[PDB]
Design a binder for this molecule. Structure first.
Ligand SMILES: [Zn+2]
Ligand SMILES: [Zn+2]
Ligand SMILES: [Zn+2]
Lengths: 76, 309, 166, 288, 45, 54, 214, 135
């Protein structure tokens, strides 16, 4: 439950932080650009910033098309 | 009468809001008149935002095909918009300020919103277009104004645009000068996707007592260094891009005229061709007169300083 | 040794030792010659590089494909040293470059021609006086060309429109 | 007399164009709403660092005239104080402003109601009906003087300065340019030449001051002001800035470039006029 | 040998300026005279 | 980008950046390299970000 | 600290004088920093030296006040022998007089006026003057020109006051002429606007007349 | 411009030799002395010849051109050379920046003079007020 809660808060901080930067990315340019725009780096934990924007593919506002990542619906 | 525009006629505004002439034409609103106070406040907010986008509300009114702007005010953005949109405690301060202005006098209501694009030009992004389309569905008479503090410094003249969206499904006519603007590569894709979903209003002022005082004062105060070289137009960028846009428009008109010469009895083509040529001519004339004024000031000041005696 | 040569052939300053090539392999006697080549390649020391090639020729170009690629490797490093020298002086005598590169004058002229034809050198060559005249690019032009093109094109456009309408 | 005599400014006041802009808008609307130039009352906010006071912003206040005295809705002011807190916390209340000429026996009544709110309030008065070329804005402070054995509050004029950030300088400069050139190219070089005309007037005023000082020194004053005189001599040595062949060549080059651009613009205007004439000429007599 | 840095070229450009300005004034006068005619007004009304 | 570019260097970091292929670079250097190319110039791997710091 | 040292010697000159004052003046000419000597000349004890038997030091001080290096060369028999610092100070003062007139000084003029033979020491003299905040400018060795942007001034024999007044009057007249020209241009622009408005009103009157006709 | 007389004192202080363990790169002292005197050359000298630059830096002209060449490559000095003429063009503010800076300096000096007369001579301020009221 410690590691479950530990992962719970860091993914919550991960999503909150990225929607503030909120720019379109090809596949790897902004996912690294968002990390340097935070308070104390290493907290992001990239393993979660990739699978939760991949978890965002079910809906709009960066629908993040699965294969050729480029349709990041920049309208919301 | 310079101050006539400052008179507020509530019944006349109610009559215009009941008439809704903008529903009869999606190109109804063509002009945007901005007060000196409004301009200054907006530019100051944009530059205080620095490299970060800020936004606010514009207070004003409508007059025929013209939208007028007078005021603008910041909304509590705790943690730089940590919630959805740059609002947070929005109408909290807004409605208080509004009742307070009905109390201290200011009766002009919401006429639009302004947003800043530090260092990436005046236009509407996808998000901006969705926002303005919503504003054109609830507060129909609304205008999306975009400012640029970084280009305000670079070019020297304030980079400002006023825009209105087209309703979903509606296509613009062929007529459209579309001035060229330098858009950075991280924004150009979105720009291109949404650039035809809105149009630009003609932004104009009307002098005024607010202008007379403000202008005179700050002018004398800081322009003792009246030189500032004399040609901030020396930077190719602006002038070059404007001339390129002119060339493109005129070449498009020529291609049209060449194809329309075969069709006998198409008056609309002649109309739009003449209008496009005329727009191109006035744009060129304004650029020319600006350059001539710059040269005049340069020549007079340089002759006075160098070999007066 | 294959990786080092391929790494140096892609015109990249990246060091192909880092963490992948352990650590002690840099000081290996059979690899120390390659390490010195990398150090000279990064430092762009053509004189030291060629000295190492001749000193350890039994293990530098001994493998035929490296001997095939040693000419290209020399061409690249000589180009890099030259490209880092053309800018500072500008309008210099050709023989001075030959002495600096420790090569013949004809080779310098051929290398200069290739560099100009690759748009790497914004300059020209005066073969009569053995001179390499580099453009200064301080004119701040390329805008008057666009203005003139716009002027001529739109004035011909206006003339054609007037002729057709009249 | 509500003005203190022999009292010098104790603090430095920095004013921004936004404050003056707010006062002008407040006076205009009240004049438009109620005929005559009704006096306006507002508040001043900004940053204060010790004895250095910087007035950056200003808002309007509510005034209720009862028993021929102005009662400021301090509760409205307090309601607005937290309103501006929500947007800007770095700005602190500094004083209040009004419009009019010399201080009247109503502003002292207003100022004392502002003195009870904060420790040291600032008083600013603008004259919208001025006729001189000077700025009709003055800043006054609160001073306690013993007049006829009674402590009477007076106003002491403060030698305030004008603070402005690069952004405000550029934005208002664009404001000046938007008046110089009219929307439809109206009064093109009217305000343009007047701007250089005023700059030359300022320079000529400086020159005439220097010349008058020299003439006075020739008769009286200090026989040799040392630094001043020597530096003025070296400065006229720069009046004939003087040039060489290269500077004149570059000046003529720029002049020729702008003249060619002007010729191109005139050609464009002429060809547009020709196009309009040909369009009409294809109509009045010609067919097809 | 003309570098176009001498006052002679500027004077020639200003003479062309005068010629073009006079031409444009004549064009505007002709446009006004055409505006006076009956057929254009009949079509406009 | 931290000894020649920025001068203040206050509230800064410049940590290390460890990838899946066990290579190591400065966080600032690799992030800026990811602008144009994204292929870990020591190989053709896509350079997942497995760690930061030493 | 040159001004403070200058004032202290001024206070001392109000009292002790004579050979001590002449030696003190020589120390002024040797101590670096003092680039203005007008304040010393205004002292009453300098006028006491005028009627005094000793005049070599006064003629020396007078030349530093108004004369230049070439004048000092001619007066090698009537002036006290200078030191290295005194010669350098006079050469710097001479450069000030030269830079005051022409803003661009060719190396030929520099080698001529200051008895300058070696060009290397000429650069040393120039850089020494600039580094001591005497003259501001840039050097062009390819063209052998000395471009001086700003330089200090010099004292006046009360005869250049008339020239200063004439220059100020000329500047005032030029400013007034430019103001009148600007006013004339504004009036011409107003007249052109009035002519355009007259043309517009003629056009609208013609249109209204035809509308009434039909 | 640093001469060869300040070398002795600094060298002794460094490490009874040079701060590290000797320098032997023509001394890091003189390497910086040449580097600094070349910077001070860039401040004033618009352009310079090989022989005169070498005499300024107390080094052979061949050494001077190489060091100037190295500093241009590293970006520590802006400028360019010409070997045929043997002339190093350090810097030139065209025609417009020089004129603008000169006029700005003239205006600033005029303002400083006006402020000095106003402050040191308030009687001048009173006289100026009287004169402007009279006319
Ligand atoms: Zn936007
Ligand atoms: Zn870093
Ligand atoms: Zn890797």
């Amino acid at each position: 439950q410690k590691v479950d809660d530990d992962r719970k808060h860091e993914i919550e901080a991960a999503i909150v932080r990225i929607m503030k930067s909120r720019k379109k990315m090809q596949h790897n340019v902004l996912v690294a650009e968002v990390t340097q725009q935070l308070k104390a780096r290493f907290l992001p934990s990239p393993v979660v910033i990739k699978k939760r924007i991949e978890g965002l593919i079910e809906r709009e506002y960066l629908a993040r098309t699965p294969e050729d990542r480029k349709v990041y619906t920049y309208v919301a | 009468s310079i101050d006539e525009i400052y008179k507020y006629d509530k019944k006349q505004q109610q009559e215009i809001l009941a008439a809704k002439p903008w529903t009869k034409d999606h190109h109804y609103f063509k002009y945007c008149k901005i007060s000196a106070l409004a301009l200054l406040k907006m530019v100051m907010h944009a530059r205080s935002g620095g490299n970060l986008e800020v936004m606010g509300l514009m207070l004003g009114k409508v007059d025929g095909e013209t939208m007028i702007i007078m005021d603008s005010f910041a909304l509590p953005v705790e943690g730089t918009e940590t919630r959805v949109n740059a609002q947070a405690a929005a109408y909290e301060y807004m409605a208080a300020y509004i009742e307070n202005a009905k109390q201290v006098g200011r009766l002009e209501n919401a006429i639009g919103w302004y947003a800043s694009h530090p260092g990436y030009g005046c236009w509407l992004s996808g998000i901006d277009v969705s926002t303005q389309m919503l504003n054109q569905q609830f507060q129909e008479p609304f205008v999306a104004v975009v400012i640029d503090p970084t280009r305000t410094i670079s070019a020297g003249k304030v980079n400002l645009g006023a825009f209105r969206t087209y309703p979903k499904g509606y296509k613009p006519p062929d007529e459209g000068p579309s001035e060229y603007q330098t858009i950075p590569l991280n924004k150009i894709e979105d720009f291109g996707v949404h650039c035809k979903q809105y149009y630009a209003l003609e932004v104009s002022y009307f002098k005024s007592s607010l202008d007379r005082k403000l202008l005179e004062l700050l002018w004398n105060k800081y322009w003792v260094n009246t030189l500032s070289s004399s040609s901030l137009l020396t930077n190719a960028d602006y002038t070059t891009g404007q001339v390129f846009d002119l060339s493109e428009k005129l070449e498009q008109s020529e291609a049209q005229l060449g194809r329309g010469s075969f069709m006998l009895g198409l008056e609309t083509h002649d109309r739009k061709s003449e209008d496009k040529l005329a727009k191109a001519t006035r744009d060129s004339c304004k650029t020319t007169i600006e350059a001539i004024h710059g040269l005049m000031s340069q020549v007079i000041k340089d002759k006075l300083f160098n070999q007066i005696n | 040794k294959y990786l080092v040569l391929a790494n140096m052939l892609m015109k990249s300053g990246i060091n192909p030792f880092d963490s992948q090539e352990a650590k002690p392999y840099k000081n290996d006697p059979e690899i120390l010659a390659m390490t010195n080549l990398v150090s000279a390649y990064q430092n762009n020391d053509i004189t030291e590089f060629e000295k190492i090639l001749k000193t350890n020729h039994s293990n530098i170009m001994d493998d035929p494909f490296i001997r095939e690629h040693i000419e290209e490797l020399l061409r690249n490093i000589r180009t890099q040293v030259l490209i880092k020298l053309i800018k500072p002086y500008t309008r210099i005598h050709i023989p001075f470059i030959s002495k600096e590169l420790n090569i013949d004058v004809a080779d310098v002229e051929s290398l200069l021609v290739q560099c100009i034809l690759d748009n790497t050198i914004h300059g020209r060559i005066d073969q009569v006086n053995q001179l390499l005249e580099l453009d200064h690019q301080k004119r701040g032009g390329a805008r008057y060309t666009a203005l003139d093109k716009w002027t001529n094109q739109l004035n011909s456009l206006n003339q054609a429109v007037v002729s057709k309408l009249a | 007399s509500v003005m203190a005599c022999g009292v010098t400014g104790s603090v430095s006041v920095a004013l921004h164009p936004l404050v003056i802009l707010n006062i002008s808008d407040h006076w205009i609307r009240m004049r438009s709403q109620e005929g005559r130039p009704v006096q306006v009352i507002g508040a001043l906010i900004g940053k204060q660092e010790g004895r250095n006071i910087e007035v950056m912003n200003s808002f309007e206040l509510l005034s209720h005239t009862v028993e021929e005295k102005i009662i400021i809705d301090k509760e409205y002011y307090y309601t607005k104080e937290e309103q501006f807190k929500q947007v800007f916390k770095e700005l602190e209340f500094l004083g209040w402003y009004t419009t009019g000429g010399p201080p009247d026996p109503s502003d002292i009544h207003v100022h004392k109601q502002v003195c009870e709110i904060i420790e040291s309030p600032l008083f600013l008065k603008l004259n919208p009906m001025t006729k001189h070329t000077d700025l009709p804005v003055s800043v006054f402070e609160s001073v306690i003087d013993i007049i006829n054995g009674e402590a009477t509050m007076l106003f002491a004029e403060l030698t305030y300065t004008l603070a402005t950030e690069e952004a405000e300088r550029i934005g208002v400069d664009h404001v000046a340019r938007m008046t110089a050139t009219g929307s439809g190219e109206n009064s093109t070089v009217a305000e343009h030449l007047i701007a250089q005309h005023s700059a030359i007037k300022m320079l000529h005023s400086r020159v005439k001051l220097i010349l008058e000082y020299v003439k006075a020194s020739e008769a009286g004053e200090v026989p040799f002001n040392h630094e001043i005189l020597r530096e003025a001599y070296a400065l006229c040595h720069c009046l004939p800035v003087l040039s060489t062949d290269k500077f004149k060549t570059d000046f003529y080059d720029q002049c020729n470039d702008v003249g060619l651009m002007a010729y191109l613009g005139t050609i464009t205007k002429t060809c547009n006029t020709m196009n309009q004439f040909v369009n009409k000429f294809n109509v009045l007599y010609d067919r097809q | 040998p003309e570098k176009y840095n001498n006052p002679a070229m500027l004077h020639n450009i200003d003479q062309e300026m005068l010629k073009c300005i006079e031409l444009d004034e004549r064009l505007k006068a002709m446009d006004q005279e055409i505006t006076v005619n009956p057929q254009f007004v009949q079509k406009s009304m | 980008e931290c000894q020649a570019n920025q001068a203040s260097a206050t509230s800064e970091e410049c940590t290390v950046a460890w990838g899946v292929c066990n290579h190591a670079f400065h966080f600032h250097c690799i992030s800026r390299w990811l602008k144009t190319r994204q292929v870990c110039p020591l190989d053709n791997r896509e350079w997942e970000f497995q760690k930061y710091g030493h | 600290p040159s001004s403070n040292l200058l004032e202290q010697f001024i206070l001392l000159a109000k009292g002790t004088s004579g050979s001590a004052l002449t030696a003190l003046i020589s120390q002024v000419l040797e101590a670096p920093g003092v680039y203005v000597f007008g304040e010393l000349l205004e002292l009453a004890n300098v006028q006491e030296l005028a009627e005094g038997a000793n005049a070599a030091y006064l003629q020396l001080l007078n030349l530093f006040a108004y004369g230049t290096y070439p004048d000092y060369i001619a007066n090698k028999e009537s002036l006290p022998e200078l030191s290295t610092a005194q010669q350098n100070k006079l050469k710097h003062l001479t450069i000030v007089s030269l830079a005051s007139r022409m803003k661009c000084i060719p190396y030929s003029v520099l080698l001529k006026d200051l008895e300058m033979r070696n060009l290397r020491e000429l650069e040393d003299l120039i850089i020494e003057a600039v580094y001591t905040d005497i003259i501001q400018g840039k050097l062009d060795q390819r063209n052998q020109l000395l471009e001086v942007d700003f330089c200090i001034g010099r004292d006046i024999r009360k005869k250049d006051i008339n020239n200063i007044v004439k220059t100020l009057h000329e500047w005032c007249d030029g400013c007034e002429a430019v103001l009148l020209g600007i006013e004339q241009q504004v009036l011409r622009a107003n007249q052109y606007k009035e002519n355009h408005n007259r043309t517009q009103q003629q056009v609208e009157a013609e249109v209204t007349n035809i509308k009434k006709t039909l | 411009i640093i001469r060869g007389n300040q070398l002795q004192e600094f060298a002794a202080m460094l490490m009874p030799h040079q701060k590290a363990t000797t320098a032997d790169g023509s001394s890091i002292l003189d390497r910086a002395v040449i580097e600094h005197n070349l910077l001070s050359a860039s401040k004033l000298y618009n352009n310079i010849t090989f022989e005169e630059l070498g005499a300024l830096l107390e080094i052979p002209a061949a050494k001077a051109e190489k060091i100037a060449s190295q500093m241009i490559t590293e970006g520590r000095m802006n400028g360019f050379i010409d070997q045929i003429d043997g002339i190093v063009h350090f810097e030139t503010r065209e025609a417009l920046p020089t004129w603008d800076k000169q006029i700005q300096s003239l205006c600033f000096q005029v303002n400083n003079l006006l402020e000095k007369i106003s402050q040191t001579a308030p009687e001048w301020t009173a006289q100026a007020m009287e004169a402007q009221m009279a006319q």
